[PDB]
mmCIF file of C-alpha atoms in Angstrom:
data_model
loop_
_atom_site.group_PDB
_atom_site.id
_atom_site.type_symbol
_atom_site.label_atom_id
_atom_site.label_comp_id
_atom_site.label_asym_id
_atom_site.label_seq_id
_atom_site.Cartn_x
_atom_site.Cartn_y
_atom_site.Cartn_z
ATOM 1 C CA UNK A 13 11.868 14.447 27.066
ATOM 2 C CA UNK A 14 15.038 14.025 29.270
ATOM 3 C CA UNK A 15 14.669 10.113 28.217
ATOM 4 C CA UNK A 16 14.191 11.459 24.481
ATOM 5 C CA UNK A 17 17.004 14.188 25.248
ATOM 6 C CA UNK A 18 19.697 11.311 26.550
ATOM 7 C CA UNK A 19 19.248 9.145 23.450
ATOM 8 C CA UNK A 20 19.854 11.917 20.824
ATOM 9 C CA UNK A 21 22.754 13.450 23.205
ATOM 10 C CA UNK A 22 24.138 10.001 22.979
ATOM 11 C CA UNK A 23 23.854 9.248 19.482
ATOM 12 C CA UNK A 24 25.314 12.578 18.617
ATOM 13 C CA UNK A 25 28.373 11.325 20.866
ATOM 14 C CA UNK A 26 27.909 14.593 22.882
ATOM 15 C CA UNK A 27 29.663 13.959 26.135
ATOM 16 C CA UNK A 28 29.329 16.731 28.353
ATOM 17 C CA UNK A 29 25.598 16.991 27.861
ATOM 18 C CA UNK A 30 24.982 13.095 28.617
ATOM 19 C CA UNK A 31 26.936 13.724 32.039
ATOM 20 C CA UNK A 32 24.339 17.229 32.510
ATOM 21 C CA UNK A 33 21.289 14.979 31.515
ATOM 22 C CA UNK A 34 22.283 11.986 34.004
ATOM 23 C CA UNK A 35 22.863 14.723 36.415
ATOM 24 C CA UNK A 36 19.024 16.182 36.208
ATOM 25 C CA UNK A 37 17.718 12.609 36.729
ATOM 26 C CA UNK A 38 17.489 11.333 32.663
ATOM 27 C CA UNK A 39 16.854 7.823 32.495
ATOM 28 C CA UNK A 40 20.176 5.886 31.488
ATOM 29 C CA UNK A 41 17.523 3.188 30.403
ATOM 30 C CA UNK A 42 15.289 5.456 28.306
ATOM 31 C CA UNK A 43 14.119 3.628 24.990
ATOM 32 C CA UNK A 44 13.510 4.826 21.500
ATOM 33 C CA UNK A 45 10.851 3.500 18.829
ATOM 34 C CA UNK A 46 12.728 0.296 17.803
ATOM 35 C CA UNK A 47 13.736 -0.324 21.429
ATOM 36 C CA UNK A 48 17.574 1.407 21.368
ATOM 37 C CA UNK A 49 19.071 2.725 24.532
ATOM 38 C CA UNK A 50 21.235 5.546 24.910
ATOM 39 C CA UNK A 51 23.845 2.728 25.588
ATOM 40 C CA UNK A 52 23.402 1.125 22.099
ATOM 41 C CA UNK A 53 23.548 4.419 20.462
ATOM 42 C CA UNK A 54 26.545 5.227 22.089
ATOM 43 C CA UNK A 55 28.122 1.493 21.287
ATOM 44 C CA UNK A 56 26.721 1.413 17.621
ATOM 45 C CA UNK A 57 28.243 4.879 17.054
ATOM 46 C CA UNK A 58 31.744 4.445 18.685
ATOM 47 C CA UNK A 59 31.410 6.791 21.557
ATOM 48 C CA UNK A 60 33.499 5.003 23.911
ATOM 49 C CA UNK A 61 33.710 7.727 27.101
ATOM 50 C CA UNK A 62 29.899 7.626 26.915
ATOM 51 C CA UNK A 63 29.410 4.002 27.260
ATOM 52 C CA UNK A 64 31.348 4.139 30.312
ATOM 53 C CA UNK A 65 29.797 7.019 31.665
ATOM 54 C CA UNK A 66 26.363 5.221 31.071
ATOM 55 C CA UNK A 67 27.578 2.124 32.688
ATOM 56 C CA UNK A 68 28.968 3.766 35.572
ATOM 57 C CA UNK A 69 25.657 5.076 36.161
ATOM 58 C CA UNK A 70 23.995 1.703 35.996
ATOM 59 C CA UNK A 71 22.758 1.586 32.340
ATOM 60 C CA UNK A 72 21.663 -2.073 31.312
ATOM 61 C CA UNK A 73 24.041 -3.629 29.872
ATOM 62 C CA UNK A 74 22.099 -6.340 28.090
ATOM 63 C CA UNK A 75 19.087 -4.589 26.784
ATOM 64 C CA UNK A 76 18.077 -5.990 23.664
ATOM 65 C CA UNK A 77 16.475 -3.620 21.296
ATOM 66 C CA UNK A 78 13.613 -4.581 18.562
ATOM 67 C CA UNK A 79 16.262 -6.909 16.533
ATOM 68 C CA UNK A 80 17.304 -8.330 19.717
ATOM 69 C CA UNK A 81 20.378 -6.704 19.490
ATOM 70 C CA UNK A 82 22.457 -5.860 22.924
ATOM 71 C CA UNK A 83 24.951 -2.673 22.669
ATOM 72 C CA UNK A 84 27.288 -5.618 22.436
ATOM 73 C CA UNK A 85 25.788 -6.799 19.244
ATOM 74 C CA UNK A 86 26.275 -3.404 17.876
ATOM 75 C CA UNK A 87 29.792 -2.585 18.783
ATOM 76 C CA UNK A 88 30.916 -5.789 17.775
ATOM 77 C CA UNK A 89 29.030 -5.583 14.205
ATOM 78 C CA UNK A 90 30.809 -2.086 13.939
ATOM 79 C CA UNK A 91 34.364 -2.902 15.281
ATOM 80 C CA UNK A 92 34.448 -0.778 17.889
ATOM 81 C CA UNK A 93 36.948 -2.764 19.877
ATOM 82 C CA UNK A 94 37.497 -0.457 23.078
ATOM 83 C CA UNK A 95 33.679 -0.652 23.609
ATOM 84 C CA UNK A 96 33.464 -4.333 23.088
ATOM 85 C CA UNK A 97 35.816 -4.778 25.987
ATOM 86 C CA UNK A 98 34.171 -1.955 28.137
ATOM 87 C CA UNK A 99 30.906 -3.856 27.852
ATOM 88 C CA UNK A 100 32.372 -6.812 28.635
ATOM 89 C CA UNK A 101 33.901 -5.574 31.776
ATOM 90 C CA UNK A 102 30.397 -4.259 33.204
ATOM 91 C CA UNK A 103 29.308 -7.819 32.790
ATOM 92 C CA UNK A 104 27.941 -7.915 28.905
ATOM 93 C CA UNK A 105 26.470 -11.632 28.104
ATOM 94 C CA UNK A 106 29.238 -12.489 25.640
ATOM 95 C CA UNK A 107 26.936 -15.096 23.949
ATOM 96 C CA UNK A 108 23.458 -12.748 24.001
ATOM 97 C CA UNK A 109 21.855 -14.118 21.221
ATOM 98 C CA UNK A 110 19.410 -11.769 18.959
ATOM 99 C CA UNK A 111 16.476 -13.022 17.189
ATOM 100 C CA UNK A 112 18.321 -15.033 14.472
ATOM 101 C CA UNK A 113 20.009 -16.717 17.399
ATOM 102 C CA UNK A 114 23.020 -14.779 16.389
ATOM 103 C CA UNK A 115 25.849 -14.167 19.100
ATOM 104 C CA UNK A 116 28.129 -10.814 18.872
ATOM 105 C CA UNK A 117 30.779 -13.107 17.530
ATOM 106 C CA UNK A 118 28.652 -14.355 14.893
ATOM 107 C CA UNK A 119 27.877 -10.688 13.676
ATOM 108 C CA UNK A 120 31.461 -9.885 14.024
ATOM 109 C CA UNK A 121 32.993 -12.608 11.910
ATOM 110 C CA UNK A 122 30.261 -11.844 9.464
ATOM 111 C CA UNK A 123 31.625 -8.187 9.000
ATOM 112 C CA UNK A 124 35.155 -9.488 8.789
ATOM 113 C CA UNK A 125 35.941 -7.801 12.304
ATOM 114 C CA UNK A 126 38.465 -10.278 13.527
ATOM 115 C CA UNK A 127 40.392 -8.302 16.218
ATOM 116 C CA UNK A 128 36.531 -8.258 17.846
ATOM 117 C CA UNK A 129 35.849 -11.564 17.497
ATOM 118 C CA UNK A 130 39.666 -12.627 19.344
ATOM 119 C CA UNK A 131 38.810 -10.853 22.248
ATOM 120 C CA UNK A 132 35.119 -11.940 21.985
ATOM 121 C CA UNK A 133 36.842 -15.430 22.422
ATOM 122 C CA UNK A 134 39.542 -14.320 25.024
ATOM 123 C CA UNK A 135 36.170 -13.108 27.009
ATOM 124 C CA UNK A 136 35.167 -16.777 26.722
ATOM 125 C CA UNK A 137 32.743 -16.321 23.769
ATOM 126 C CA UNK A 138 31.406 -19.496 22.671
ATOM 127 C CA UNK A 139 31.612 -20.626 19.032
ATOM 128 C CA UNK A 140 28.926 -23.429 19.319
ATOM 129 C CA UNK A 141 26.916 -21.228 21.033
ATOM 130 C CA UNK B 9 -6.186 -18.400 25.815
ATOM 131 C CA UNK B 10 -4.071 -19.863 22.536
ATOM 132 C CA UNK B 11 -2.946 -23.217 23.033
ATOM 133 C CA UNK B 12 0.834 -23.800 23.899
ATOM 134 C CA UNK B 13 0.997 -26.280 20.939
ATOM 135 C CA UNK B 14 -0.487 -26.212 17.522
ATOM 136 C CA UNK B 15 -1.875 -29.167 15.783
ATOM 137 C CA UNK B 16 -2.483 -29.047 12.316
ATOM 138 C CA UNK B 17 -4.908 -32.455 11.692
ATOM 139 C CA UNK B 18 -4.956 -32.045 8.063
ATOM 140 C CA UNK B 19 -0.616 -32.385 7.896
ATOM 141 C CA UNK B 20 0.024 -34.187 11.120
ATOM 142 C CA UNK B 21 2.662 -31.627 11.880
ATOM 143 C CA UNK B 22 2.904 -30.208 15.486
ATOM 144 C CA UNK B 23 4.034 -26.751 16.339
ATOM 145 C CA UNK B 24 5.259 -25.732 19.785
ATOM 146 C CA UNK B 25 4.601 -22.137 20.514
ATOM 147 C CA UNK B 26 7.692 -19.699 20.881
ATOM 148 C CA UNK B 27 8.604 -16.185 20.843
ATOM 149 C CA UNK B 28 6.256 -13.445 20.403
ATOM 150 C CA UNK B 29 6.858 -11.673 17.341
ATOM 151 C CA UNK B 30 3.967 -8.801 17.097
ATOM 152 C CA UNK B 31 0.236 -8.173 16.693
ATOM 153 C CA UNK B 32 -1.472 -6.780 13.658
ATOM 154 C CA UNK B 33 -4.701 -6.077 13.245
ATOM 155 C CA UNK B 34 -6.663 -9.174 14.246
ATOM 156 C CA UNK B 35 -3.350 -11.397 14.645
ATOM 157 C CA UNK B 36 -0.611 -11.966 16.800
ATOM 158 C CA UNK B 37 2.413 -13.514 15.381
ATOM 159 C CA UNK B 38 4.794 -16.084 17.388
ATOM 160 C CA UNK B 39 7.866 -18.158 15.891
ATOM 161 C CA UNK B 40 6.848 -22.050 16.097
ATOM 162 C CA UNK B 41 8.355 -24.943 15.812
ATOM 163 C CA UNK B 42 8.184 -27.984 14.039
ATOM 164 C CA UNK B 43 8.500 -30.574 16.560
ATOM 165 C CA UNK B 44 9.677 -33.145 14.833
ATOM 166 C CA UNK B 45 11.856 -31.439 11.889
ATOM 167 C CA UNK B 46 12.598 -28.344 14.613
ATOM 168 C CA UNK B 47 12.366 -26.085 11.841
ATOM 169 C CA UNK B 48 10.896 -22.590 12.807
ATOM 170 C CA UNK B 49 8.314 -20.514 10.977
ATOM 171 C CA UNK B 50 6.003 -17.428 11.951
ATOM 172 C CA UNK B 51 2.966 -18.562 13.471
ATOM 173 C CA UNK B 52 0.175 -16.087 12.778
ATOM 174 C CA UNK B 53 -2.879 -16.804 14.949
ATOM 175 C CA UNK B 54 -6.044 -15.174 14.420
ATOM 176 C CA UNK B 55 -8.910 -15.838 17.207
ATOM 177 C CA UNK B 56 -12.298 -16.611 15.277
ATOM 178 C CA UNK B 57 -13.927 -13.975 18.607
ATOM 179 C CA UNK B 58 -12.438 -11.517 15.990
ATOM 180 C CA UNK B 59 -13.330 -12.997 12.709
ATOM 181 C CA UNK B 60 -17.078 -12.198 13.795
ATOM 182 C CA UNK B 61 -18.252 -11.774 10.179
ATOM 183 C CA UNK B 62 -18.305 -9.452 7.027
ATOM 184 C CA UNK B 63 -14.963 -7.646 5.773
ATOM 185 C CA UNK B 64 -12.313 -9.022 8.660
ATOM 186 C CA UNK B 65 -13.771 -13.217 7.929
ATOM 187 C CA UNK B 66 -13.266 -13.171 4.277
ATOM 188 C CA UNK B 67 -10.475 -10.838 4.422
ATOM 189 C CA UNK B 68 -9.099 -13.954 6.485
ATOM 190 C CA UNK B 69 -10.549 -16.386 3.947
ATOM 191 C CA UNK B 70 -9.285 -14.187 0.719
ATOM 192 C CA UNK B 71 -5.959 -13.509 2.249
ATOM 193 C CA UNK B 72 -5.409 -17.202 2.873
ATOM 194 C CA UNK B 73 -6.606 -18.453 -0.768
ATOM 195 C CA UNK B 74 -4.538 -15.745 -2.313
ATOM 196 C CA UNK B 75 -1.348 -15.910 -0.540
ATOM 197 C CA UNK B 76 -1.546 -20.029 -0.486
ATOM 198 C CA UNK B 77 -1.516 -20.039 -4.772
ATOM 199 C CA UNK B 78 2.001 -17.667 -4.538
ATOM 200 C CA UNK B 79 5.596 -18.988 -4.355
ATOM 201 C CA UNK B 80 8.455 -16.462 -4.899
ATOM 202 C CA UNK B 81 11.739 -15.367 -3.876
ATOM 203 C CA UNK B 82 10.460 -12.021 -2.743
ATOM 204 C CA UNK B 83 6.864 -13.016 -1.420
ATOM 205 C CA UNK B 84 6.622 -14.297 2.107
ATOM 206 C CA UNK B 85 6.548 -18.307 1.956
ATOM 207 C CA UNK B 86 3.090 -19.930 2.753
ATOM 208 C CA UNK B 87 3.243 -23.416 4.585
ATOM 209 C CA UNK B 88 -0.031 -24.187 5.419
ATOM 210 C CA UNK B 89 -3.013 -23.021 7.650
ATOM 211 C CA UNK B 90 -5.236 -24.874 9.902
ATOM 212 C CA UNK B 91 -8.121 -24.144 12.709
ATOM 213 C CA UNK B 92 -9.648 -25.202 16.020
ATOM 214 C CA UNK B 93 -12.521 -24.138 17.654
ATOM 215 C CA UNK B 94 -11.148 -20.879 18.315
ATOM 216 C CA UNK B 95 -8.566 -19.771 16.155
ATOM 217 C CA UNK B 96 -7.010 -19.910 12.575
ATOM 218 C CA UNK B 97 -3.323 -20.876 12.384
ATOM 219 C CA UNK B 98 -1.402 -19.659 9.396
ATOM 220 C CA UNK B 99 1.898 -21.030 9.068
ATOM 221 C CA UNK B 100 4.480 -18.650 7.573
ATOM 222 C CA UNK B 101 7.911 -18.199 6.443
ATOM 223 C CA UNK B 102 9.798 -16.693 9.135
ATOM 224 C CA UNK B 103 11.360 -13.189 8.402
ATOM 225 C CA UNK B 104 13.713 -12.537 11.539
ATOM 226 C CA UNK B 105 15.051 -9.173 10.521
ATOM 227 C CA UNK B 106 11.486 -7.586 11.028
ATOM 228 C CA UNK B 107 10.541 -4.963 8.218
ATOM 229 C CA UNK B 108 11.368 -1.853 6.301
ATOM 230 C CA UNK B 109 9.278 -0.184 8.764
ATOM 231 C CA UNK B 110 11.779 -0.667 11.438
ATOM 232 C CA UNK B 111 14.735 0.116 9.503
ATOM 233 C CA UNK B 112 12.893 3.226 8.410
ATOM 234 C CA UNK B 113 12.482 4.303 11.825
ATOM 235 C CA UNK B 114 15.987 3.800 12.344
ATOM 236 C CA UNK B 115 17.727 5.326 9.669
ATOM 237 C CA UNK B 116 15.050 7.801 7.705
ATOM 238 C CA UNK B 117 16.411 8.504 4.685
ATOM 239 C CA UNK B 118 18.650 5.633 3.055
ATOM 240 C CA UNK B 119 21.728 6.297 0.755
ATOM 241 C CA UNK B 120 20.637 5.282 -2.860
ATOM 242 C CA UNK B 121 22.565 1.945 -3.281
ATOM 243 C CA UNK B 122 20.297 0.768 -0.467
ATOM 244 C CA UNK B 123 17.105 1.964 -1.637
ATOM 245 C CA UNK B 124 17.835 0.711 -5.528
ATOM 246 C CA UNK B 125 18.827 -3.013 -3.685
ATOM 247 C CA UNK B 126 15.616 -3.056 -1.581
ATOM 248 C CA UNK B 127 13.155 -1.608 -4.383
ATOM 249 C CA UNK B 128 14.501 -3.787 -7.002
ATOM 250 C CA UNK B 129 13.693 -7.070 -4.841
ATOM 251 C CA UNK B 130 10.329 -5.194 -4.029
ATOM 252 C CA UNK B 131 9.629 -4.647 -7.723
ATOM 253 C CA UNK B 132 10.473 -8.145 -8.555
ATOM 254 C CA UNK B 133 8.019 -9.452 -6.171
ATOM 255 C CA UNK B 134 5.265 -7.436 -7.502
ATOM 256 C CA UNK B 135 6.046 -8.279 -10.994
ATOM 257 C CA UNK B 136 5.286 -11.873 -10.014
ATOM 258 C CA UNK B 137 2.093 -11.223 -8.352
ATOM 259 C CA UNK B 138 1.033 -9.116 -11.445
ATOM 260 C CA UNK B 139 2.011 -11.752 -13.595
ATOM 261 C CA UNK B 140 -0.287 -13.939 -11.521
ATOM 262 C CA UNK B 141 -3.061 -11.843 -11.583
ATOM 263 C CA UNK B 142 -2.836 -10.318 -7.958
ATOM 264 C CA UNK B 143 -2.822 -6.933 -6.768
ATOM 265 C CA UNK B 144 -1.637 -6.742 -3.436
ATOM 266 C CA UNK B 145 -3.401 -3.221 -2.677
ATOM 267 C CA UNK B 146 -1.677 -2.559 0.624
ATOM 268 C CA UNK B 147 2.270 -1.860 -0.058
ATOM 269 C CA UNK B 148 3.996 -0.259 2.789
ATOM 270 C CA UNK B 149 7.159 -0.539 4.760
ATOM 271 C CA UNK B 150 5.485 -2.533 7.336
ATOM 272 C CA UNK B 151 4.701 -5.705 5.051
ATOM 273 C CA UNK B 152 7.951 -5.650 3.508
ATOM 274 C CA UNK B 153 9.774 -8.008 5.635
ATOM 275 C CA UNK B 154 13.488 -8.684 5.752
ATOM 276 C CA UNK B 155 15.323 -12.376 6.395
ATOM 277 C CA UNK B 156 18.484 -12.996 7.781
ATOM 278 C CA UNK B 157 20.352 -11.870 4.477
ATOM 279 C CA UNK B 158 18.102 -8.695 3.951
ATOM 280 C CA UNK B 159 16.133 -10.624 1.035
ATOM 281 C CA UNK B 160 12.844 -8.462 0.892
ATOM 282 C CA UNK B 161 9.723 -10.809 1.150
ATOM 283 C CA UNK B 162 6.334 -9.198 0.478
ATOM 284 C CA UNK B 163 3.821 -10.248 3.108
ATOM 285 C CA UNK B 164 0.242 -9.279 4.358
ATOM 286 C CA UNK B 165 -2.394 -10.153 1.414
ATOM 287 C CA UNK B 166 -5.246 -9.141 3.363
ATOM 288 C CA UNK B 167 -6.318 -6.086 1.146
ATOM 289 C CA UNK B 168 -4.876 -8.378 -2.009
ATOM 290 C CA UNK B 169 -7.179 -9.341 -4.619
ATOM 291 C CA UNK B 170 -7.309 -11.476 -7.952
ATOM 292 C CA UNK B 171 -8.035 -10.426 -11.356
ATOM 293 C CA UNK B 172 -10.516 -12.425 -12.783
ATOM 294 C CA UNK B 173 -10.914 -11.361 -16.182
ATOM 295 C CA UNK B 174 -8.968 -8.470 -18.240
ATOM 296 C CA UNK B 175 -9.712 -5.123 -18.173
ATOM 297 C CA UNK B 176 -11.230 -5.801 -14.634
ATOM 298 C CA UNK B 177 -12.376 -2.414 -12.582
ATOM 299 C CA UNK B 178 -11.596 -3.457 -8.906
ATOM 300 C CA UNK B 179 -14.549 -0.914 -6.843
ATOM 301 C CA UNK B 180 -13.989 -2.523 -3.405
ATOM 302 C CA UNK B 181 -11.647 -3.074 -0.990
ATOM 303 C CA UNK B 182 -11.716 -4.918 2.149
ATOM 304 C CA UNK B 183 -10.229 -2.199 4.135
ATOM 305 C CA UNK B 184 -8.539 1.341 3.773
ATOM 306 C CA UNK B 185 -4.657 1.180 1.987
ATOM 307 C CA UNK B 186 -2.169 2.662 3.696
ATOM 308 C CA UNK B 187 -1.320 4.780 0.505
ATOM 309 C CA UNK B 188 -4.568 5.790 -1.117
ATOM 310 C CA UNK B 189 -3.969 5.905 -4.913
ATOM 311 C CA UNK B 190 -5.991 8.546 -6.227
ATOM 312 C CA UNK B 191 -8.016 6.390 -8.050
ATOM 313 C CA UNK B 192 -9.415 4.748 -5.189
ATOM 314 C CA UNK B 193 -10.240 8.114 -4.117
ATOM 315 C CA UNK B 194 -12.229 8.451 -7.425
ATOM 316 C CA UNK B 195 -15.393 6.589 -8.608
ATOM 317 C CA UNK B 196 -13.453 5.106 -11.652
ATOM 318 C CA UNK B 197 -12.205 2.030 -10.135
ATOM 319 C CA UNK B 198 -8.784 0.567 -9.769
ATOM 320 C CA UNK B 199 -6.411 -2.631 -11.065
ATOM 321 C CA UNK B 200 -2.830 -3.141 -11.023
ATOM 322 C CA UNK B 201 -1.517 0.483 -11.225
ATOM 323 C CA UNK B 202 -2.170 1.015 -7.459
ATOM 324 C CA UNK B 203 0.785 -0.907 -6.502
ATOM 325 C CA UNK B 204 3.030 0.992 -8.684
ATOM 326 C CA UNK B 205 1.688 3.996 -7.019
ATOM 327 C CA UNK B 206 2.570 2.321 -3.629
ATOM 328 C CA UNK B 207 5.719 1.630 -4.810
ATOM 329 C CA UNK B 208 6.441 5.131 -5.876
ATOM 330 C CA UNK B 209 5.247 6.487 -2.353
ATOM 331 C CA UNK B 210 7.898 3.340 -0.751
ATOM 332 C CA UNK B 211 10.471 5.042 -3.111
ATOM 333 C CA UNK B 212 9.970 8.314 -2.144
ATOM 334 C CA UNK B 213 9.907 7.231 1.764
ATOM 335 C CA UNK B 214 13.375 5.657 1.282
ATOM 336 C CA UNK B 215 15.238 8.061 -0.335
ATOM 337 C CA UNK B 216 13.770 11.220 1.394
ATOM 338 C CA UNK B 217 13.179 10.082 4.447
ATOM 339 C CA UNK B 218 9.344 11.005 4.874
ATOM 340 C CA UNK B 219 6.297 10.287 3.132
ATOM 341 C CA UNK B 220 5.245 12.073 -0.351
ATOM 342 C CA UNK B 221 1.763 13.132 0.832
ATOM 343 C CA UNK B 222 1.157 12.501 4.528
ATOM 344 C CA UNK B 223 -0.004 15.696 6.338
ATOM 345 C CA UNK B 224 -1.303 16.314 9.883
ATOM 346 C CA UNK B 225 -5.145 16.400 8.811
ATOM 347 C CA UNK B 226 -6.401 13.543 6.715
ATOM 348 C CA UNK B 227 -8.591 16.111 4.354
ATOM 349 C CA UNK B 228 -5.662 17.939 3.609
ATOM 350 C CA UNK B 229 -3.429 14.758 2.622
ATOM 351 C CA UNK B 230 -6.275 13.378 0.338
ATOM 352 C CA UNK B 231 -6.790 16.795 -1.199
ATOM 353 C CA UNK B 232 -2.782 16.493 -2.257
ATOM 354 C CA UNK B 233 -3.412 12.995 -3.749
ATOM 355 C CA UNK B 234 -5.976 13.964 -5.664
ATOM 356 C CA UNK B 235 -3.966 17.168 -7.021
ATOM 357 C CA UNK B 236 -0.831 15.325 -7.141
ATOM 358 C CA UNK B 237 1.038 17.881 -4.835
ATOM 359 C CA UNK B 238 4.275 16.554 -3.349
ATOM 360 C CA UNK B 239 7.725 17.776 -3.711
ATOM 361 C CA UNK B 240 10.896 15.812 -4.580
ATOM 362 C CA UNK B 241 13.812 17.494 -2.560
ATOM 363 C CA UNK B 242 16.752 18.477 -4.972
ATOM 364 C CA UNK B 243 18.898 16.428 -3.418
ATOM 365 C CA UNK B 244 17.943 13.399 -4.958
ATOM 366 C CA UNK B 245 19.638 12.445 -7.967
ATOM 367 C CA UNK B 246 17.827 13.112 -11.121
ATOM 368 C CA UNK B 247 17.138 9.557 -12.624
ATOM 369 C CA UNK B 248 15.665 8.565 -9.198
ATOM 370 C CA UNK B 249 13.700 11.551 -8.849
ATOM 371 C CA UNK B 250 12.080 10.765 -12.655
ATOM 372 C CA UNK B 251 11.222 7.390 -11.684
ATOM 373 C CA UNK B 252 9.624 8.705 -8.467
ATOM 374 C CA UNK B 253 7.423 11.003 -11.132
ATOM 375 C CA UNK B 254 6.672 8.369 -13.383
ATOM 376 C CA UNK B 255 4.930 6.428 -10.491
ATOM 377 C CA UNK B 256 3.350 9.356 -8.635
ATOM 378 C CA UNK B 257 0.958 10.333 -11.319
ATOM 379 C CA UNK B 258 -2.828 10.841 -11.454
ATOM 380 C CA UNK B 259 -3.614 9.107 -14.427
ATOM 381 C CA UNK B 260 -3.047 5.380 -13.544
ATOM 382 C CA UNK B 261 -2.393 4.641 -17.394
ATOM 383 C CA UNK B 262 0.650 7.110 -17.334
ATOM 384 C CA UNK B 263 2.478 5.383 -14.883
ATOM 385 C CA UNK B 264 4.899 2.556 -16.272
ATOM 386 C CA UNK B 265 3.927 -1.126 -15.627
ATOM 387 C CA UNK B 266 5.625 -3.348 -13.083
ATOM 388 C CA UNK B 267 7.991 -4.553 -16.060
ATOM 389 C CA UNK B 268 8.489 -1.105 -17.406
ATOM 390 C CA UNK B 269 9.409 -0.057 -13.626
ATOM 391 C CA UNK B 270 11.979 -3.249 -13.387
ATOM 392 C CA UNK B 271 13.446 -1.832 -16.648
ATOM 393 C CA UNK B 272 13.903 1.543 -15.300
ATOM 394 C CA UNK B 273 17.236 3.494 -15.669
ATOM 395 C CA UNK B 274 17.377 3.493 -12.155
ATOM 396 C CA UNK B 275 17.542 -0.085 -12.014
ATOM 397 C CA UNK B 276 19.761 -1.007 -15.044
ATOM 398 C CA UNK B 277 22.504 1.693 -13.986
ATOM 399 C CA UNK B 278 23.218 2.916 -10.887
ATOM 400 C CA UNK B 279 25.102 0.510 -7.760
ATOM 401 C CA UNK B 280 23.609 -2.345 -5.949
ATOM 402 C CA UNK B 281 25.626 -3.630 -3.549
ATOM 403 C CA UNK B 282 26.592 -7.443 -3.401
ATOM 404 C CA UNK B 283 25.956 -7.477 0.362
ATOM 405 C CA UNK B 284 24.408 -5.084 2.670
ATOM 406 C CA UNK B 285 26.122 -4.822 6.383
ATOM 407 C CA UNK B 286 24.279 -5.933 9.086
ATOM 408 C CA UNK B 287 24.997 -2.687 10.522
ATOM 409 C CA UNK B 288 22.823 -1.160 7.689
ATOM 410 C CA UNK B 289 19.752 -1.433 10.360
ATOM 411 C CA UNK B 290 20.954 0.878 12.542
ATOM 412 C CA UNK B 291 23.734 3.468 10.856
ATOM 413 C CA UNK B 292 24.305 4.254 7.189
ATOM 414 C CA UNK B 293 27.171 2.120 5.177
#
């Protein structure tokens, strides 16, 4: 359940619990039944401290779920700017394609998250990707 | 053993096999690309080794015959079929956003406007099926597909049947539906009303976050189905709660028809969003 616990702790945004689970040897790359990892769940939920914790402990920055969303896709679509930056600093593929062939910039543009679009562009997002 | 290129000898179109999308029963699905047009489809690939006779072979044939006759905004598009000596290839509309199953696994209970939004489309697609004398007979989250605009397309006609004459009572199915309607359990036969039952179960699942009858043992489940034993939690709104009840009745003739369903207060009033954000695949709007 160490993988499962971490998934839930990362979703819930419970920062101390996450550190304790990782120190316990919890798999930072655990996946749930639609391919979501702790990093996905922290990103989509806006839990910035947790994203950084996961990445520092070697979480797969470019892990894709059942839709082909990377944590960057999920942060970009929900408008969590600080997380988009973090993920980028840890080598998230700015032009990662989901199963529609959409990059995080497509997804952010569609949701009206223009500051994200702007940051993604600065980090070298290709509009014609 | 699957060919990397799919050649249709009838149409002259050829398709390059791409991304694996998933298996389901006897078939694997891949994205396939028209080599000329560059259009992408769902290629459903069935090995003949598994089309080794009865309920499986003509469940392939009946399914193809039914599906190919259909064309509607809320039904998976049928683009064609062909075969070689080893496989049967079915070319379908690619729905890139998976199905309501994946949504349900992530979200559990939806907000009511989302449910209304999906359910109207499901009902409209099913209305079109009924008007063309097709009973789907296996409506479930996993065959209610979503395209890039989060529009619902009904697929998987493997259990479907054509009402050939008026008042016909179907007695047999080519497999086991996900939601067994109580009349399927009985000896009295079934008709169009089974699809209304399954839409009831779906509506309950979308609003409540869990299925209406399913328990840990199949005997107890079927018994509750037979006895109409289920419970709608109190946080469900009265209009929606009342429509679930209309659909989930033992007597098939007591349920609304598909058109009466479409015309329910639940659909003609209440909020339907112009757009669901893509975030709705993962977190509540």
